[PDB]
Amino acid sequence: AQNPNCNIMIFHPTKEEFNDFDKYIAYMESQGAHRAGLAKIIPPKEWKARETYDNISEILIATPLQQVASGRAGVFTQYHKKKKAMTVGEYRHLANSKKYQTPPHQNFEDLERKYWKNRIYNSPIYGADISGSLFDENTKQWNLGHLGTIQDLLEKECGVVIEGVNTPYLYFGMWKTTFAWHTEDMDLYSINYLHLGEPKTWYVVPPEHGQRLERLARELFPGSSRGCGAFLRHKVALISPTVLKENGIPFNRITQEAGEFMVTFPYGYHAGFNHGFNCAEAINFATPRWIDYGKMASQCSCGEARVTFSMDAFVRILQPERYDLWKRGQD
Numbered sequence: 001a002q003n004p005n006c007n008i009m010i011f012h013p014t015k016e017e018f019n020d021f022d023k024y025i026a027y028m029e030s031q032g033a034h035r036a037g038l039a040k041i042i043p044p045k046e047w048k049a050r051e052t053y054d055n056i057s058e059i060l061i062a063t064p065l066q067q068v069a070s071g072r073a074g075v076f077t078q079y080h081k082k083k084k085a086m087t088v089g090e091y092r093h094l095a096n097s098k099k100y101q102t103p104p105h106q107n108f109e110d111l112e113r114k115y116w117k118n119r120i121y122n123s124p125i126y127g128a129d130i131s132g133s134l135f136d137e138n139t140k141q142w143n144l145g146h147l148g149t150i151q152d153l154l155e156k157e158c159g160v161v162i163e164g165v166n167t168p169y170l171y172f173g174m175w176k177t178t179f180a181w182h183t184e185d186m187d188l189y190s191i192n193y194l195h196l197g198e199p200k201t202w203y204v205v206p207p208e209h210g211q212r213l214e215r216l217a218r219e220l221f222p223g224s225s226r227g228c229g230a231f232l233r234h235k236v237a238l239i240s241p242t243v244l245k246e247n248g249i250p251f252n253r254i255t256q257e258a259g260e261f262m263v264t265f266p267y268g269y270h271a272g273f274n275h276g277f278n279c280a281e282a283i284n285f286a287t288p289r290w291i292d293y294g295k296m297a298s299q300c301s302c303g304e305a306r307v308t309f310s311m312d313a314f315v316r317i318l319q320p321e322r323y324d325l326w327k328r329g330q331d
Ligand SMILES: O=C(O)CNC(=O)C(=O)O
Pocket: 171, 178, 179, 190, 191, 192, 264, 270, 280, 282, 283
């Protein structure tokens, strides 16, 4: 078995290997990358996502989210308070202000220490989940707006034609902005490209050990667990590396820098934080190996998780027994 310790792997494809996206994902899996839940892909030196980032300041963040924490430093939840619209240029200036800017630090490890110590005492503002793309239309390799769609994959594998579309999302971050512990909708893959700015630190649990994380989460968030049998679908709970180590949960960590791709694999729980002002782009995707994970994915039916239009068909076709209850949660 390849990669039996479930380490995060880093790949350096050549420009020739960067042509065929599906083939390279299958190659990474042949080397055991998926066992970690997360992989890093450094593009060939010849590639670029677009020519410059000089003209992005007029993009609108219609609903910036202030991430307010409750709990203790290593075990907390966050809720998202909606703020007034602002442009990317206005958000960048806010991120660089004395109130929100990254503090002085020695290295990534020192910054990680400061994040875990101090996150809860601040409420950073996240420009998350903005439909759109920063890939130039002429970028032909690993262009996250030109991938094969999940609906076309289901159709190719299973023969059933379904409604829905699959488009990317932009994330404009600042120091301490946080992504809570989650897997993707329907336990899909995700791919994330860091276009510009300061790094993003990730934590991940191997897919084969995901239920260990879920059992800890039910212990640490006992009211939430009573409310919903899949409450990590709410995307609000944080647990620190120190707490994970104290409870014997297998995980790994890695820092993504500008110009790098990360791939999350089906049922790989992940969480993390931004180091400073940055912009990422991400989208979900599927492969043939996903189908069995999609059929087994947990679902939130309590009403909190509320998701996209396109998840309807995935539930309806892959999980017809769950469909009626899940749909009530959506309505
Ligand atoms: O970058 C973020 O805030 C969150 N990203 C992801 O969870 C992802 O790409 O799967």
